[PDB]
Design a protein around this motif. Structure first.
Motif, PDB file in Angstrom:
ATOM      1  N   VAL A  24      -1.199  -5.869   1.051  1.00 36.16           N
ATOM      2  CA  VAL A  24       0.144  -5.810   1.566  1.00 36.16           C
ATOM      3  C   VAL A  24       0.824  -4.554   0.988  1.00 36.16           C
ATOM      4  CG1 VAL A  24       1.049  -7.443  -0.196  1.00 36.16           C
ATOM      5  CG2 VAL A  24       2.357  -7.034   1.844  1.00 36.16           C
ATOM      6  N   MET A  25       1.584  -3.839   1.817  1.00 33.63           N
ATOM      7  CA  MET A  25       2.272  -2.642   1.384  1.00 33.63           C
ATOM      8  C   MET A  25       3.749  -2.896   1.538  1.00 33.63           C
ATOM      9  SD  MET A  25       0.021   0.177   3.465  1.00 33.63           S
ATOM     10  CE  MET A  25      -1.772   0.259   3.355  1.00 33.63           C
ATOM     11  N   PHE A  26       4.521  -2.602   0.495  1.00 32.58           N
ATOM     12  CA  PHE A  26       5.966  -2.765   0.514  1.00 32.58           C
ATOM     13  C   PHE A  26       6.676  -1.429   0.449  1.00 32.58           C
ATOM     14  CE2 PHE A  26       4.610  -6.824  -1.274  1.00 32.58           C
ATOM     15  CZ  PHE A  26       5.415  -7.722  -0.613  1.00 32.58           C
ATOM     16  N   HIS A  27       7.846  -1.368   1.079  1.00 32.65           N
ATOM     17  CA  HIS A  27       8.736  -0.230   0.974  1.00 32.65           C
ATOM     18  C   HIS A  27      10.057  -0.723   0.460  1.00 32.65           C
ATOM     19  CE1 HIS A  27      11.779   2.741   2.307  1.00 32.65           C
ATOM     20  NE2 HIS A  27      10.838   3.585   1.921  1.00 32.65           N
ATOM     21  N   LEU A  28      10.545  -0.089  -0.590  1.00 33.96           N
ATOM     22  CA  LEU A  28      11.686  -0.572  -1.324  1.00 33.96           C
ATOM     23  C   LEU A  28      12.610   0.550  -1.683  1.00 33.96           C
ATOM     24  CD1 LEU A  28      11.718  -2.957  -4.363  1.00 33.96           C
ATOM     25  CD2 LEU A  28      12.882  -0.756  -4.504  1.00 33.96           C
ATOM     26  N   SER A  63      -1.223  -5.649  -8.444  1.00 32.15           N
ATOM     27  CA  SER A  63      -0.630  -4.346  -8.189  1.00 32.15           C
ATOM     28  C   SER A  63      -1.738  -3.312  -8.248  1.00 32.15           C
ATOM     29  CB  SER A  63       0.414  -4.024  -9.250  1.00 32.15           C
ATOM     30  OG  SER A  63       1.576  -4.770  -9.025  1.00 32.15           O
ATOM     31  N   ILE A  64      -1.959  -2.589  -7.147  1.00 32.10           N
ATOM     32  CA  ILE A  64      -3.045  -1.608  -7.064  1.00 32.10           C
ATOM     33  C   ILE A  64      -2.545  -0.160  -7.183  1.00 32.10           C
ATOM     34  CG2 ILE A  64      -5.029  -0.857  -5.800  1.00 32.10           C
ATOM     35  CD1 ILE A  64      -5.095  -3.812  -6.535  1.00 32.10           C
ATOM     36  N   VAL A  65      -1.588   0.199  -6.350  1.00 29.93           N
ATOM     37  CA  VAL A  65      -1.011   1.527  -6.379  1.00 29.93           C
ATOM     38  C   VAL A  65       0.488   1.402  -6.278  1.00 29.93           C
ATOM     39  CG1 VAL A  65      -1.015   3.824  -5.327  1.00 29.93           C
ATOM     40  CG2 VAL A  65      -3.015   2.351  -5.085  1.00 29.93           C
ATOM     41  N   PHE A 117      -2.629   4.019   2.423  1.00 28.72           N
ATOM     42  CA  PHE A 117      -1.376   3.806   1.719  1.00 28.72           C
ATOM     43  C   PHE A 117      -0.769   5.147   1.345  1.00 28.72           C
ATOM     44  CE2 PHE A 117       0.850   3.211  -2.349  1.00 28.72           C
ATOM     45  CZ  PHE A 117       1.911   2.478  -1.875  1.00 28.72           C
ATOM     46  N   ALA A 118      -1.610   6.066   0.889  1.00 31.42           N
ATOM     47  CA  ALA A 118      -1.130   7.394   0.494  1.00 31.42           C
ATOM     48  C   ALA A 118      -0.527   8.139   1.690  1.00 31.42           C
ATOM     49  CB  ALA A 118      -2.252   8.193  -0.135  1.00 31.42           C
ATOM     50  N   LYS A 119      -1.152   8.021   2.855  1.00 31.43           N
ATOM     51  CA  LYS A 119      -0.573   8.594   4.052  1.00 31.43           C
ATOM     52  C   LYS A 119       0.837   8.075   4.324  1.00 31.43           C
ATOM     53  CE  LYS A 119      -4.637  10.135   6.425  1.00 31.43           C
ATOM     54  NZ  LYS A 119      -5.157  10.605   7.753  1.00 31.43           N
ATOM     55  N   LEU A 120       1.058   6.774   4.199  1.00 31.69           N
ATOM     56  CA  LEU A 120       2.401   6.271   4.388  1.00 31.69           C
ATOM     57  C   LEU A 120       3.340   6.794   3.340  1.00 31.69           C
ATOM     58  CD1 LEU A 120       1.672   2.609   5.389  1.00 31.69           C
ATOM     59  CD2 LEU A 120       2.502   4.417   6.897  1.00 31.69           C
ATOM     60  N   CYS A 121       2.881   6.907   2.102  1.00 25.55           N
ATOM     61  CA  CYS A 121       3.777   7.406   1.073  1.00 25.55           C
ATOM     62  C   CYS A 121       4.247   8.808   1.463  1.00 25.55           C
ATOM     63  CB  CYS A 121       3.096   7.422  -0.280  1.00 25.55           C
ATOM     64  SG  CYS A 121       2.661   5.801  -0.928  1.00 25.55           S
ATOM     65  N   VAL A 122       3.300   9.642   1.879  1.00 20.63           N
ATOM     66  CA  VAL A 122       3.617  11.020   2.258  1.00 20.63           C
ATOM     67  C   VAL A 122       4.537  11.042   3.486  1.00 20.63           C
ATOM     68  CG1 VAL A 122       2.703  13.236   2.997  1.00 20.63           C
ATOM     69  CG2 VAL A 122       1.551  11.985   1.233  1.00 20.63           C
ATOM     70  N   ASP A 173     -10.500   3.415   1.387  1.00 15.33           N
ATOM     71  CA  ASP A 173      -9.942   3.487   2.703  1.00 15.33           C
ATOM     72  C   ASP A 173      -8.483   3.045   2.720  1.00 15.33           C
ATOM     73  OD1 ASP A 173     -10.349   3.848   5.631  1.00 15.33           O
ATOM     74  OD2 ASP A 173      -9.905   1.696   5.658  1.00 15.33           O
ATOM     75  N   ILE A 174      -8.225   1.890   2.116  1.00 11.65           N
ATOM     76  CA  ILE A 174      -6.898   1.287   2.138  1.00 11.65           C
ATOM     77  C   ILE A 174      -5.958   2.079   1.240  1.00 11.65           C
ATOM     78  CG2 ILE A 174      -5.551  -0.801   1.714  1.00 11.65           C
ATOM     79  CD1 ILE A 174      -8.121  -2.410   2.235  1.00 11.65           C
ATOM     80  N   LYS A 175      -6.458   2.534   0.080  1.00 12.63           N
ATOM     81  CA  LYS A 175      -5.658   3.391  -0.817  1.00 12.63           C
ATOM     82  C   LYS A 175      -5.247   4.686  -0.153  1.00 12.63           C
ATOM     83  CE  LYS A 175      -7.798   1.767  -5.015  1.00 12.63           C
ATOM     84  NZ  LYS A 175      -8.407   2.078  -6.338  1.00 12.63           N
ATOM     85  N   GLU A 176      -6.137   5.245   0.656  1.00 15.48           N
ATOM     86  CA  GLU A 176      -5.819   6.477   1.356  1.00 15.48           C
ATOM     87  C   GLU A 176      -4.841   6.235   2.530  1.00 15.48           C
ATOM     88  OE1 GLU A 176      -5.839   9.547   0.844  1.00 15.48           O
ATOM     89  OE2 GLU A 176      -5.324  10.214   2.866  1.00 15.48           O
TER      90      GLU A 176
END
Length: 159
Positions: A101-105, A21-23, A134-139, A129-132
């Protein structure tokens, strides 16, 4: 390389194995802070016939426990269902299989609902790069940055 659910090109068998688990991100922050029930640290993913089995650790009042869940593939495209602190429905937003891998729940419980997004890596850490990304998708899903939490900087029950 980017295998989404929106392409339906998702070879779920290649998700098998160890993950970290990263973010984690939630529009209901309480759930991913200490003693939040969604502050879980993934260890392993087991791909089964039409289900995914996750092994998690969690820290309740200073003690790590390990537990497992099995999520069943639902009739809808890419969706999975699993029962944990409510009813959870989730999809795999994006993955390259051998890094991230990025999950949406979405969790429903007592009529309340919240979103949870998780970024897992095949290593304890991932690049900026990947964390950012991911942050874009969160937003993009309406989870603002103050509700995104980098776990790589905290006890994840590795030891």
């Amino acid at each position: 390389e980017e295998a989404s659910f929106e392409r339906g090109n998702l070879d779920v068998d290649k998700l098998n194995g160890d993950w970290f688990s990263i973010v984690v991100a939630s529009d209901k922050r309480e759930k991913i802070e200490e003693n939040g029930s969604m502050r879980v640290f993934v260890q392993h993913i087991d791909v089964l016939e039409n289900s995914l089995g996750f092994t998690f650790r969690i820290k309740e009042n200073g003690v790590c426990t390990e537990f497992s869940l099995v999520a069943d593939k639902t009739a809808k495209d890419g969706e999975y269902f699993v029962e944990y602190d409510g009813e959870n429905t989730f999809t795999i937003l994006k993955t390259d299989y051998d890094n991230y891998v990025m999950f949406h729940l979405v969790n429903v419980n007592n009529g309340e609902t919240f979103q949870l997004m998780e970024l897992y890596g095949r290593t304890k850490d991932l690049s900026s790069d990947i964390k950012e990304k991911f942050a874009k998708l969160c937003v993009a899903h309406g989870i603002t940055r103050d509700n995104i939490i980098d776990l790589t900087k905290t006890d994840r029950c590795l030891q």
